[PDB]
């Protein structure tokens, strides 16, 4: 079956925030509120902000999972193309088939679900650093949207679930993802069709 993508703020008032980076040619990662769509270059830092009304307990965990947006493709597992799967860009932690990685977190953990075969990456929730109102996770996407043998120009969603130490759903949110060479231009072009 297909993982739930239904928004759920839950007890702790869980929602996602994004940097306001604009669409200049030099930008590596930019978000479109209009499309609720993130545009990142291959393997480059993709900051996602966790916002809460109340601090969840210690041992709370944040999980990222990719699915295909279109109904006909939803049952197919999102994974890296054979080319990117084979290439030597391994960090020693991430499985080579996994699209979504986390950088600068040695407590990162990766799951091949034994039932659904779905890929996900999970880190411990940490409260905001002193002088901050949200928690930032740096994701890396390791395959282009245009990759034949992979996503093959098919739109994907990233599902961020907040869960406790025992794996109970606390909150869920989602955003569309495109991995492309010129994020600035592509966002500006996709917003032009409004
Ligand atoms: Sb990005
Ligand atoms: Zn690829």
Curated annotation (Swiss-Prot):
Changing residue 49 to H: In sporadic cancers; somatic mutation. Changing residue 63 to Y: In a sporadic cancer; somatic mutation; requires 2 nucleotide substitutions. Changing residue 96 to H: In sporadic cancers; somatic mutation. Changing residue 118 to Q: In LFS; germline mutation and in sporadic cancers; somatic mutation. Changing residue 129 to V: In a sporadic cancer; somatic mutation. Changing residue 172 to W: In sporadic cancers; somatic mutation. Changing residue 169 to V: In a sporadic cancer; somatic mutation. Changing residue 146 to P: In sporadic cancers; somatic mutation. Changing residue 143 to G: In LFS; germline mutation and in sporadic cancers; somatic mutation. Residues 178-185 are annotated as: Interaction with DNA. This is Cellular tumor antigen p53. It comes from Homo sapiens. The chain holds residues 96 to 289 of 393 of the full protein.
């Amino acid at each position: 079956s297909v993982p739930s993508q239904k928004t759920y703020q839950g007890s702790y008032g869980f929602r996602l925030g994004f940097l306001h980076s604009g669409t200049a040619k030099s930008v590596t990662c930019t978000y479109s509120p209009a499309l609720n769509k993130m545009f990142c270059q291959l393997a480059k830092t993709c900051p996602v902000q966790l916002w809460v009304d109340s601090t969840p307990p210690p041992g709370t965990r944040v999980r990222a999972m990719a699915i295909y947006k279109q109904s006909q493709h939803m049952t197919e597992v999102v994974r890296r193309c054979p080319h990117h799967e084979r290439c030597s860009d391994s960090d020693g932690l991430a499985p080579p088939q996994h699209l979504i990685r986390v950088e600068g977190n040695l407590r990162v953990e990766y799951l091949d679900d034994r039932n659904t075969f779905r890929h996900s990456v999970v880190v411990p929730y940490e409260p905001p650093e002193v002088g901050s109102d949200c928690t930032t996770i740096h994701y890396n996407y390791m395959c282009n949207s245009s990759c034949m043998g992979g996503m093959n120009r098919r739109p994907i969603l990233t599902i961020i679930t907040l869960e406790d130490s025992s794996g109970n759903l606390l909150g869920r949110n989602s955003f569309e993802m495109r991995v492309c060479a010129c994020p600035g231009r592509d966002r500006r072009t996709e917003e032009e069709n409004l």
